[PDB]
Nucleic acid binder design. Structure first.
Ligand SMILES: Nc1nc2c(ncn2[C@@H]2O[C@H](COP(=O)(O)O)[C@@H](O)[C@H]2O)c(=O)[nH]1
Ligand SMILES: [Mg+2]
Ligand SMILES: [Mg+2]
Ligand SMILES: [Mg+2]
Ligand SMILES: [Mg+2]
Ligand SMILES: [Mg+2]
Ligand SMILES: [Mg+2]
Ligand SMILES: [Mg+2]
Ligand SMILES: [Mg+2]
Ligand SMILES: [Mg+2]
Ligand SMILES: [Mg+2]
Ligand SMILES: [Mg+2]
Ligand SMILES: [Mg+2]
Ligand SMILES: [Mg+2]
Ligand SMILES: [Mg+2]
Ligand SMILES: [Mg+2]
Ligand SMILES: [Mg+2]
Ligand SMILES: [Mg+2]
Ligand SMILES: [Mg+2]
Ligand SMILES: [Mg+2]
Ligand SMILES: [Mg+2]
Ligand SMILES: [Mg+2]
Ligand SMILES: [Mg+2]
Ligand SMILES: [Mg+2]
Ligand SMILES: [Mg+2]
Ligand SMILES: [Mg+2]
Ligand SMILES: [Mg+2]
Ligand SMILES: [Mg+2]
Ligand SMILES: [Mg+2]
Ligand SMILES: [Mg+2]
Ligand SMILES: [Mg+2]
Ligand SMILES: [Mg+2]
Ligand SMILES: [Mg+2]
Ligand SMILES: [Mg+2]
Ligand SMILES: [Mg+2]
Ligand SMILES: [Mg+2]
Ligand SMILES: [Mg+2]
Ligand SMILES: [Mg+2]
Ligand SMILES: [Mg+2]
Ligand SMILES: [Mg+2]
Ligand SMILES: [Mg+2]
Ligand SMILES: [Mg+2]
Ligand SMILES: [Mg+2]
Ligand SMILES: [Mg+2]
Ligand SMILES: [Mg+2]
Ligand SMILES: [Mg+2]
Ligand SMILES: [Mg+2]
Ligand SMILES: [Mg+2]
Ligand SMILES: [Mg+2]
Ligand SMILES: [Mg+2]
Lengths: 94, 148, 55, 104, 177
RNA sequence: GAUUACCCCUUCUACCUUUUGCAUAAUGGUUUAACCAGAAAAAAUCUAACAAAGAGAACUUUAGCUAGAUACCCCGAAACCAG
RNA sequence: GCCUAACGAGCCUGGUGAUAGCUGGUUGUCCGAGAAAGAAUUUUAGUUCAACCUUAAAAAUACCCCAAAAACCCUAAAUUCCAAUGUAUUUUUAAGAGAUAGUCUAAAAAGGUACAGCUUUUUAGAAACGGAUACAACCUUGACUAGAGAGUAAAAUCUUAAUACU
RNA sequence: AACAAACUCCUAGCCCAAUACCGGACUAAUCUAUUGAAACAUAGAAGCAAUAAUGUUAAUAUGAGUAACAAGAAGCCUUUCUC
RNA sequence: CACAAACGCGUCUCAGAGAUAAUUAAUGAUUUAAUCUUAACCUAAUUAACUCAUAAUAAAUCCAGCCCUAGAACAGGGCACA
């Protein structure tokens, strides 16, 4: 008897839905975690210049491994045991 | 599906494992072809493994028949009377071995849905709840509006 | 015999009498049947709990 | 095996995964939360000392689960998948619950 | 613990008759516990496919109380199905007409909406005052505690309790009451 | 899903097609059986032969040549022309 | 109008398997990745190029990116560009198609009535088997299999209803 | 607080959803070559798999024992009556 | 009106009590005057609805046939006078 015009949640006229004490709690708890979050982000150990190149040795190494892993891709070895081993299909008792 | 098929409660045959454990698998019958390739694995299994298997399980009698068949089968048969058929057709030695083991360690009960994971006779030690168990008794044992 | 009762396999037909005899043997006297709990007497499905008392 | 059970002598449990034991082996189930008897009960925090209680179970039967169908479907996307699952199972008979007098 | 099988099973699933006094209670708080006991949700053995549910006898239904202005504002509506058969009736009017109605409707609204509602509605017995067939009296196991504590009027208090509570202010002798 | 138990309880808005979006009150089908719809090797890749050459003639070649294997549907107009 | 029950031009056979950018249909199982539109076009019911994407193959840097740096009157959210650092991606080569008829939500604007579940661009997002009773697009959530375990997420009735002035 | 998910732990694993297009691994049934000989194997081939085309043909239901259909009368049986 | 009927153009009958809305009053506090009062207590005067008195229905199982002011069928009323 009291219709919501058009589609429920979309248009110029929407279903009114209210904010719940639950929702306020949840949102606030998130906020608290974030405030703490940006407390711990506030004081670095090293300064900006103290970390320059501080590990550049590891980073280059990693990339050398990444490269090396790809360079190794080649068709696999083929062995006699395969092509010959196929004959085992017809093996018998006699 | 579960409404589709039959079902059973969890049980043992003859209360196995209570007094002592009895391996339920009774006999094992292989049928294979000396010639046919389909039976290849089954032949190798008979060569190497069967012998050792027979020592590892003294209580099961193993009948091996070479015959002209296209589809090697193994027929497990249990103390329960239960007969379970299998096809070893076109498998490794390894596969067959694993299969024969499954057969060795099964109860012979039918494989269907099992209604619940536990089976207890006398679950109830120290009582079984009834509507009165937690209710206080009154003086004279009168009902709510009863007068004396 | 696992899971089975006593009176499942014993089949004795008059429990009261047998009880009285066994209590004579134990030198205890007179079990008195005393009604303990009940729900609905007027129902087609009543439930009674009868207790037995000795002294 | 990741679950809790209410166990008593002579009984049966069905574990939903493989155990490495021969059929017939006796096994001490170690973690014990609760022990109980008609007149008393011991509670763990959250476990009972191995000296306080010992429950031994036999493995009766190694087996596999009945086939369980699993079917994904989507309306007018032409997508079905049907997969049959069979799970390895292990049936334990629990044998004895013994309880040692040492308690303080 | 040792019972034969049949009597054990019978004792466990046994029906029970609760008596619930209604005088000065909100039909809602009444219907809450009534609903629980009808569905047999107070039994640890509960399941939806077991018939378990117990009889509930509510009495003094006429003396039901309604918090706020609900007696005026709460309207029970129904429709005969015939054109112009739509009937709205204020709770005061409904109660005036049929003593049992209010509490019955509330309970019927709080049961689950399946077919079992119709069955477990048959285990509910409602009496406007305290007059109960002795048949129905003889089954009553126990009486549920009333869900609202009823405040006493001023004339209910003992003079001890009246002199025990402090005079808060001191009225002028000149002032007339 | 289950369940001692057929129902009763609980959970799920047929399927194709078409669409931004279909339980749709958009399309198609009473049902059963039998029939009823992806086809080609230029370049490519993969496997192999022989290799500054390869192909059982004719060609191609600054690692190529030769061979093999990998590929591209079904039903439907109103019409038009000749006899 | 009529010319053998349909004549804006008969019927039958052949041309004929006419031709349809248009509709319909298109048959075993399981696994790996996986796509919303810039350009032309008698073109917007379609094609062919880009950008993405797929299958192989070669490589080397790829995103992320602090200062420094990019306009003349006023001018925001912010871009561009780049070391470090966190990661494993990106670029070429060889083969390929599909797709190119788009929805809502938030944001900046335009048109309209500071109308539309309206229309036109730009940035972002989504298209749960959980929640918002029902629900495409809102919110929670790195979609495997079996358990008769466990912890969590989003989430369920919104407040007020007040005016004495001798 | 609790209760509440494809999230996350837990015990095991065969260890992570999908439309158009794309890649892969398997395979039903036929035939041929050799095996095989209570119904198969390794290859090679194909008219190689139908819950959807107002699909074709046959057969069956539903609507439905429904709509609709018919013979003037008696008698001694071909004689009288009535139209 | 050419069936014994059906029929109108003809004939007969048709209602009590309680409840309210708007709006009027009486008593009377917060605010010792006043004031109908989303102040109490009793209160009066007051539309239509709407409920309800009251009316109607109300004997479980003979039923072949045959009749009917009963009826599509099925049901239903008659069938001892005479
Ligand atoms: N052009 C285009 N169409 C898409 C894409 N993804 C989905 N679609 C279309 O969306 C429809 C259905 O979407 P879905 O069933 O995948 O949710 C189909 O018409 C399908 O072709 C895309 O990335 N590009
Ligand atoms: Mg709407
Ligand atoms: Mg709207
Ligand atoms: Mg449309
Ligand atoms: Mg599309
Ligand atoms: Mg929908
Ligand atoms: Mg519609
Ligand atoms: Mg319909
Ligand atoms: Mg539609
Ligand atoms: Mg239509
Ligand atoms: Mg339809
Ligand atoms: Mg259409
Ligand atoms: Mg269709
Ligand atoms: Mg149709
Ligand atoms: Mg070529
Ligand atoms: Mg292709
Ligand atoms: Mg022309
Ligand atoms: Mg033309
Ligand atoms: Mg003609
Ligand atoms: Mg064509
Ligand atoms: Mg076009
Ligand atoms: Mg269409
Ligand atoms: Mg997409
Ligand atoms: Mg042009
Ligand atoms: Mg392109
Ligand atoms: Mg910068
Ligand atoms: Mg850079
Ligand atoms: Mg287009
Ligand atoms: Mg729009
Ligand atoms: Mg966008
Ligand atoms: Mg939902
Ligand atoms: Mg996810
Ligand atoms: Mg995801
Ligand atoms: Mg949970
Ligand atoms: Mg996951
Ligand atoms: Mg995938
Ligand atoms: Mg073949
Ligand atoms: Mg075919
Ligand atoms: Mg067919
Ligand atoms: Mg038709
Ligand atoms: Mg068809
Ligand atoms: Mg018929
Ligand atoms: Mg007939
Ligand atoms: Mg009909
Ligand atoms: Mg007729
Ligand atoms: Mg005639
Ligand atoms: Mg006064
Ligand atoms: Mg006055
Ligand atoms: Mg009446
Ligand atoms: Mg009669």
């Amino acid at each position: 008897r009291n219709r919501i015009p058009g589609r429920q949640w979309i248009g110029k006229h929407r279903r009114p839905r209210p904010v719940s004490a639950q929702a306020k709690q949840n949102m606030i708890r998130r906020l608290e975690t974030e405030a703490e979050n940006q407390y711990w982000l506030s004081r670095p150990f090293l300064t900006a210049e103290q970390e320059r190149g501080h590990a550049a040795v590891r980073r280059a190494a990693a990339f050398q491994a990444l490269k090396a892993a790809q360079a190794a891709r080649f068709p696999a070895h083929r062995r006699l045991e395969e092509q010959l081993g196929h004959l085992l299909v017809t093996r018998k008792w006699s | 599906t579960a409404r589709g098929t039959a079902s059973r409660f969890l049980t043992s045959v003859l209360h196995n494992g209570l007094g002592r454990y009895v391996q339920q698998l009774q006999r094992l019958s292989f049928s294979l072809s000396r010639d046919a390739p389909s039976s290849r694995g089954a032949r190798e299994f008979v060569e190497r493994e069967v012998t050792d298997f027979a020592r590892r399980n003294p209580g099961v009698v193993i009948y091996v028949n070479p015959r002209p068949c296209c589809v090697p089968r193994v027929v497990a048969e249990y103390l329960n009377g239960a007969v379970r058929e299998e096809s070893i057709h076109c498998k490794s030695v390894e596969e067959i071995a694993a299969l024969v083991q499954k057969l060795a360690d099964q109860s012979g009960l039918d494989v269907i849905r099992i209604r619940k994971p536990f089976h207890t006779d006398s679950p109830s030690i120290q009582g079984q709840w009834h509507p009165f168990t937690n209710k206080p008794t009154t003086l004279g044992g009168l009902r709510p509006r009863e007068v004396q | 015999m696992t899971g089975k009762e006593l009176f499942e396999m014993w089949t004795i037909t008059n429990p009261m009498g047998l009880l009285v005899e066994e209590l004579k043997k134990r030198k205890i006297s007179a079990p008195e049947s005393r009604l303990t709990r009940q729900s609905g007497s007027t129902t087609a499905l009543p439930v009674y709990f009868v207790g037995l008392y000795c002294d | 095996a990741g679950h809790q059970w209410k166990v008593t002598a002579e009984d049966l449990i069905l574990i939903e995964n493989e155990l490495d034991v021969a059929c017939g082996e006796r096994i001490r189930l170690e973690k014990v939360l609760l022990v109980g008897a008609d007149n008393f009960t011991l509670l763990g925090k959250p476990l009972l000392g191995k000296e306080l209680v010992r429950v031994e179970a036999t493995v009766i039967e190694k087996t596999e689960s009945w086939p369980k169908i699993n079917m994904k479907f989507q309306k007018r996307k032409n997508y079905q998948r049907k997969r049959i699952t069979v799970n390895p199972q292990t049936v334990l008979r629990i044998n004895s619950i013994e309880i040692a007098p040492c308690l303080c | 613990s040792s019972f034969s099988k049949a009597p054990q099973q019978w004792a466990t699933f046994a029906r029970v008759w609760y008596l619930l006094d209604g005088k000065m209670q909100p039909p809602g708080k009444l219907a809450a516990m009534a609903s629980v006991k009808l569905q047999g949700l107070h039994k640890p053995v509960y399941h939806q496919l077991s018939d378990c549910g117990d009889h509930v006898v509510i009495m003094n239904t006429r003396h039901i109380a309604f918090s706020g202005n609900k007696w005026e504002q709460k309207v029970y509506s129904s429709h005969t199905g015939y054109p112009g058969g739509f009937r709205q009736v204020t709770a005061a009017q409904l109660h005036q007409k049929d003593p049992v109605a209010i509490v019955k409707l509330a309970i019927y609204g709080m049961l689950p909406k399946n077919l079992h509602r119709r069955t477990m509605m048959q285990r509910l017995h409602l009496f406007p005052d305290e007059d109960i067939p002795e048949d129905i009296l003889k089954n009553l196991v126990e009486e549920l505690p009333q869900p609202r504590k009823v405040p006493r009027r001023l004339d209910e208090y003992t003079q001890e309790e009246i002199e025990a509570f402090p005079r808060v202010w001191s009225p002028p002798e000149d002032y007339r009451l």
